[PDB]
Design a protein around this ligand. Structure first.
Ligand code: ADP
Ligand code: NLG
Ligand code: MG
Length: 245
């Protein structure tokens, strides 16, 4: 126990944060726990694309993103999701800060496959030293799912991918992938537990589809690298538990 938890918050999930959620965060912070928050915003980016007349195309659960598209992506993530997260937490007495210009000094990335996906990135390195300044200061850093190429270009990163990189870089005790379903569902009920060795065969039988594909792959990659537990569900405490074994 390093006493470190990474919380990743999905698009819908960030717009419905409960009283239980807000108290649990404040109580962990008051008990000395070190907390880092990562968030996405697919539902918001989709809305914005419509309102601005661009076509949503995804491939393998990843959004095809042109350079013009990135203006839309960064606006929805920073101004339409991230600012609300920071305001709800501060109003509840949690000490925290949205990264904006600090993003380029923390998350390095490269193009996943330019010809297929455009400006979609894969994380290449996390600079721990600047996340550590916030934590040493008892303040929770809030990170949108964005990174920067070696040449300085902003890239769109699937939020689950960013959460794995962050949890692994800090050697976290636990990662929570909080979303808008109660667990990973199979045959009409929530699965209580799954090990990393069983994930591939549920993506092969297509039990798991769409956005739950990058979610469950990130969970498996995290425990495989030594993080003790990953939770997938709609809250901080109950849902599906994933372990290396
Ligand atoms: N086996 C499954 N169990 C649960 N959800 C699934 C499954 N297969 C596909 N999904 C879909 O994955 C979605 C969650 O991923 P996503 O839509 O990207 O949410 P988030 O914004 O939290 O990342 C669920 O809302 C559900 O529609
Ligand atoms: C929707 C969307 O563009 N997703 C991301 C980033 C946001 C999120 O994960 O919620 C992506 O495909 O790369
Ligand atoms: Mg998603």
């Amino acid at each position: 126990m390093k006493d470190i938890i990474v919380i990743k918050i999905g698009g819908v999930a960030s717009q419905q944060l409960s009283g239980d959620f807000l108290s649990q965060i404040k109580n962990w912070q008051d008990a000395g726990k070190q907390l880092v928050i990562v968030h996405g915003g697919g539902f918001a980016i989709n809305k914005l694309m419509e309102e601005n007349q661009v076509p949503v195309k995804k491939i393998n659960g990843l959004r095809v993103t042109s350079k013009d598209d990135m203006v839309l992506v960064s606006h929805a993530l920073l101004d339409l999701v991230g600012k609300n997260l920071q305001e709800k937490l501060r109003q509840a007495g949690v000490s925290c800060q949205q990264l904006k210009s600090d993003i380029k000094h923390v998350v390095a990335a490269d193009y996943l496959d330019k010809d297929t996906y455009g400006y979609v990135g894969d994380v290449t390195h996390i600079n721990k030293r600047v996340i550590e300044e916030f934590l040493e200061n008892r303040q929770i850093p809030i990170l949108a799912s964005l990174g920067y190429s070696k040449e300085g270009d902003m890239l769109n990163i699937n939020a689950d991918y960013l959460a794995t990189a962050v949890a692994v870089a800090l050697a976290a005790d636990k990662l929570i992938l909080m979303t808008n379903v109660k667990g990973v569902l199979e045959n009409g009920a929530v699965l209580e537990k799954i090990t990393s060795h069983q994930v591939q065969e549920k993506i092969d039988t297509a039990v798991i589809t769409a956005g739950m594909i990058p979610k469950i792959e990130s969970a498996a990659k995290t425990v495989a690298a030594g993080v003790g537990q990953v939770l997938i569900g709609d809250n901080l405490l109950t849902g599906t538990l994933i372990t290396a074994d």
